[PDB]
Amino acid sequence: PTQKKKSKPGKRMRNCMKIENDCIFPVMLDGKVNGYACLVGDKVMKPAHVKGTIDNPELAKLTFKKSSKYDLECAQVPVCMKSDASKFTHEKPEGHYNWHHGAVQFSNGRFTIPTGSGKPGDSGRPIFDNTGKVVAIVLGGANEGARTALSVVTWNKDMVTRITPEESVEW
Amino acid sequence: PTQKKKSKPGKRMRNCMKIENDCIFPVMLDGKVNGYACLVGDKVMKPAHVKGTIDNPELAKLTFKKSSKYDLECAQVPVCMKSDASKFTHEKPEGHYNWHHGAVQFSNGRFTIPTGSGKPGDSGRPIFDNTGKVVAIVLGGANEGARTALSVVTWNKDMVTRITPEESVEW
Amino acid sequence: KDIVPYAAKNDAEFPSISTTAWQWLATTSGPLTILVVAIIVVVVVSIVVCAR
Amino acid sequence: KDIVPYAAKNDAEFPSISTTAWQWLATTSGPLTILVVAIIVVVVVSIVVCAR
Amino acid sequence: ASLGLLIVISSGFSCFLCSVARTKCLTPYQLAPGAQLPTFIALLCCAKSARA
């Protein structure tokens, strides 16, 4: 059958655009990428591996009030920092299969991607969606089966402050 | 050219391009538009951008009982005024796009528009769903970094008055 | 002097400590009681605003 | 050490059982209030992780 | 002895309180977000007073 309405481009002449655009920033300490920063949610949550690794020095000094028990921030940053980061989250899309890896399955309480990188300073990168909402922040993962199980801190409409699989490496 | 539901006869006598209202009146002060009046609902919610500009001296004095700590007025106006009065709002639609301009998406508990609005003289126009239900009246705004967080007074299903990220200033 | 007889020592309210004295005094109580309620009604509306 | 008579028996508190001895003893509630706050917070974290 | 005891109640209360404020943020966030609800505010008032 056909489409009997449109509210957007009915057709295309080539592909030269990308469906979602990253907004991430790598973050340096001794000139090395030891995480990725973004400044997301309503109240701002990122630090777990960018506690040490500076976003901007002023910003580092400014933010901290934390639950260092599980490493979750409950302090927030300016609007200035916030616009330049990935889009904010308040709900969980689970229909998303694009960020940086080819498919994101949520089943059996675990996020998986197919067998990927798990090399130093890949930690703290957000898992961004097709409307760029951040569903999870990578703490690490461990490869098994043909998939990579991920360890995450979450905050959407449903939330667990640090949760880990049976087997894990510190990425 | 059959569509799902025809909403034009194939002619420019009905259009899908509306973006303005006919319940607006600008209210002058020093020869400058420092707001707009419309006398919204039957228990009239307006002065917060048109408290210092007013509409005419007589309607204001008569009407005005307020909760000046959030600057919302409560009080009925007569039959004359009510006949041309905007829509009564007591419910909240989710997701909006028109007000005057081409976005007022309501997600993450924020309305945002692109940078190049929040200008006064264009402030006081209601945020409409294409039925003239007003969830908030736009008072001013603040630039986030690439988007503009907006200054509002709301009253729909719930109050939660002056939803802002952490501090925006009326302009 | 009340004019009903009343006599109680060691403090006397001027008509001493009596039912009638206690009853008349009960006025003072009124603003204080309502005052606890008044605060609460003010507060709950504020919680909504703050919440976002 | 004012002086005000008190009993000279039974428990050892060193002016013995006294309104003053009891009033000094009433620190005992302080350690209990700070303990109730610790119990609640320790059990409540464990409960959150489980809750969601 | 009694004078030293009072100081212990203040030292223990204050230090614990601080830890309590970080759990007060955590629990309703994790529970069921918690990002726009009035629920956060009741717990939050305590937490603001603790941290500052």
Q: How far is D31 from chain A (nearest CA, A)?
A: 25
CA distances from B114 to B19, B146, B154 (A): 16, 7, 20
Quote the longest CA-to-CA distance of chain C.
64
Dihedral sign from CA coordinates of A135, A137, A139, A145: positive
Contact, A119 vs A171, CB < 8 A?
yes
Query: A93: closest CA among A45, A132, A61, A142?
Result: A132
> A112-139: b or e for each residue (b if 16 or more CB lie within 10 Å)?
bbeeeebeebbbbbbbbbeebbbbbbbb
Residue B69 and residue C48: Cα distance in Å, rounded? Answer: 14
- DSSP labels, C1-52: --SS----SS---SS-S-HHHHHHHTTTHHHHHHHHHHHHHHHHHHHHHHH-
Q: How far is C48 from chain E (nearest CA, A)?
A: 6
Out of B49, B55, B117, B151, the active site residue is B49
Counting every residue written for chain E, the total comes to 52
Tell me the Cα Rg of chain B: 17
> E15-39: b or e for each residue (b if 16 or more CB lie within 10 Å)?
ebbebbbbbbbbbbbbeebbbeebe
Q: By three-state DSSP, how is residue A37 classified?
A: strand
Name the strand (E) or helix (H) holding E48.
helix E39-51
Residue B107 and residue B139: Cα distance in Å, rounded? Answer: 19
Residue A156 and residue A32: Cα distance in Å, rounded? Answer: 30
Contact, B86 vs B39, CB < 8 A?
yes
Residue B98 and residue B111: Cα distance in Å, rounded? Answer: 11
> B73-108: b or e for each residue (b if 16 or more CB lie within 10 Å)?
beeebeeeeeeebbbebeebeeebebbbbeebebeb
User: What are A86's two structure tokens?
Assistant: 């990935």
Contact, B121 vs B171, CB < 8 A?
no
Neighbours of chain B (3+ CB pairs under 8 A): A, C, E
Taking CA–CA distances from E31, the nearest residue in chain A reads: A159
Torsion angles phi and psi, residue A54, rounded to 5 = -85, 140
Query: A60: closest CA among A52, A68, A48?
Result: A52
Contact, E29 vs A159, CB < 8 A?
yes
Residue E29 and residue D45: Cα distance in Å, rounded? Answer: 12
Torsion angles phi and psi, residue A151, rounded to 5 = -110, 135
Cβ neighbours of residue B83 under 8 Å, at least 6 residues apart?
Answer: none
Q: Phi/psi zone of residue A78: left (φ > 0), alpha (ψ -120 to 50 degrees), beta?
A: beta
- DSSP labels, E4-47: HHHHHHHHHHHHHHHHHHHHHHHHHHHHS--SS-THHHHHHHHH
Contact, E21 vs E46, CB < 8 A?
yes
Total CB pairs under 8 A between chain A and D: 7
Residue type (1 letter), B98: N
Torsion angles phi and psi, residue A115, rounded to 5 = -35, 115
Name the strand (E) or helix (H) holding B49.
none
At least 3 CB pairs under 8 A between chains A and B: yes
Residue A155 and residue C51: Cα distance in Å, rounded? Answer: 18
Taking CA–CA distances from B108, the nearest residue in chain A reads: A90
User: What are B90's two structure tokens?
Assistant: 């007591």
Q: Which residues in A have their CB inside 8 Å of a CB on D?
A: 69, 158-161
**Is B96 annotated in the active site?**
no
User: What are C18's two structure tokens?
Assistant: 């009596």
Q: How far is E38 from chain B (nearest CA, A)?
A: 10
Burial of A150 (0-12, 13-18, 19+ CB in 10 A): buried
Q: Which residues in E have their CB inside 8 Å of a CB on B?
A: 35-36
User: What are A152's two structure tokens?
Assistant: 């995450």
- How many other C-beta atoms lie within 10 A of the C-beta of residue C42? 9
- How many other C-beta atoms lie within 10 A of the C-beta of residue A43? 19
- DSSP labels, B116-134: TB--SSS-S-B-BSSS---
Contact, B23 vs B37, CB < 8 A?
no
Residue of E29, E41, E43, E46 to mutate, interface with A, max A Cβ within 10 Å? E29
Question: What ranges in B9-128 are assigned the alpha helix state H?
Answer: 57-63, 79-82
- The conformation of residue A88, written as its DSSP 8-state character, comes to P
Residue A39 and residue A42: Cα distance in Å, rounded? Answer: 9
At least 3 CB pairs under 8 A between chains C and D: no
Which 8-47 residues of chain D touch chain A by CB within 8 A?
A: 45
Residue C16 and residue C10: Cα distance in Å, rounded? Answer: 9
User: What are A144's two structure tokens?
Assistant: 């098994």
CA atoms within a 13 Å half-sphere pointing along the CA-CB vector of A1: 5
Tell me the Cα Rg of chain C: 20
- DSSP labels, B156-168: SSS---S--SS--
Residue B156: its chain C contacts at CB < 8 A? none
Name the strand (E) or helix (H) holding B143.
strand B136-143
Residue type (1 letter), B152: V
Query: Cβ separation of A69 and D48 shorter than 8 Å?
Result: no
Beta-bridge partner residues of A107 = A110
Beta-bridge partner residues of B26 = B36
Query: Cβ separation of E29 and A74 shorter than 8 Å?
Result: yes
Contact, B95 vs B109, CB < 8 A?
no
Contact, B123 vs B142, CB < 8 A?
no
Residue B169: its chain A contacts at CB < 8 A? none
User: What are C43's two structure tokens?
Assistant: 């507060």
Cβ neighbours of residue D44 under 8 Å, at least 6 residues apart?
Answer: E23, E27
User: What are E37's two structure tokens?
Assistant: 């609800």
**Is A123 annotated in the active site?**
yes
**Is A90 annotated in the active site?**
no
Residue of A40, A67, A158 to mutate, interface with E, max E Cβ within 10 Å? A67
- DSSP labels, A107-164: ETTEEEEES----TT-TT-EEE-TT-BEEEEEEEEEEETTEEEEEEEE-SSS--SSB-
Residue type (1 letter), A11: K
Residue D48: its chain A contacts at CB < 8 A? 161
Query: A91: closest CA among E34, E40, B149?
Result: E34
Q: By three-state DSSP, how is residue A20 classified?
A: coil
Residue B153 and residue B74: Cα distance in Å, rounded? Answer: 13
Residue E42 and residue E27: Cα distance in Å, rounded? Answer: 12
Residue E35: its chain B contacts at CB < 8 A? 109
Q: Phi/psi zone of residue B7: left (φ > 0), alpha (ψ -120 to 50 degrees), beta?
A: alpha
Residue D23 and residue D29: Cα distance in Å, rounded? Answer: 11
Q: Which of A4, A81, A88 sits opposite B4 (nearest CB)?
A: A4
Packing angle of the helix pair E2-31, E39-51 (nearest 10 deg): 140
Out of B55, B96, B117, B123, the active site residue is B123
- How many other C-beta atoms lie within 10 A of the C-beta of residue B170? 19
The sheet that has A147-154: what strands, in order across it? Answer: A105-107, A110-114, A147-154, A134-144, A126-128
Cβ neighbours of residue D1 under 8 Å, at least 6 residues apart?
Answer: D15
Residue B160: its chain E contacts at CB < 8 A? 36
User: What are B64's two structure tokens?
Assistant: 């005005």
- DSSP labels, A40-93: -TTTT---SSSSSSBS-HHHHHHH--EETTTTEE-----HHHHHHSSBP-SS--
Residue of A70, A90, A159, A163 to mutate, interface with E, max E Cβ within 10 Å? A159
At least 3 CB pairs under 8 A between chains D and B: no
Residue E9 and residue D33: Cα distance in Å, rounded? Answer: 9
Q: By three-state DSSP, how is residue D20 classified?
A: helix
Query: Cβ separation of E30 and D31 shorter than 8 Å?
Result: no
- The conformation of residue A87, written as its DSSP 8-state character, comes to B
CA angle B141, B145, B115 (to 5 degrees): 55
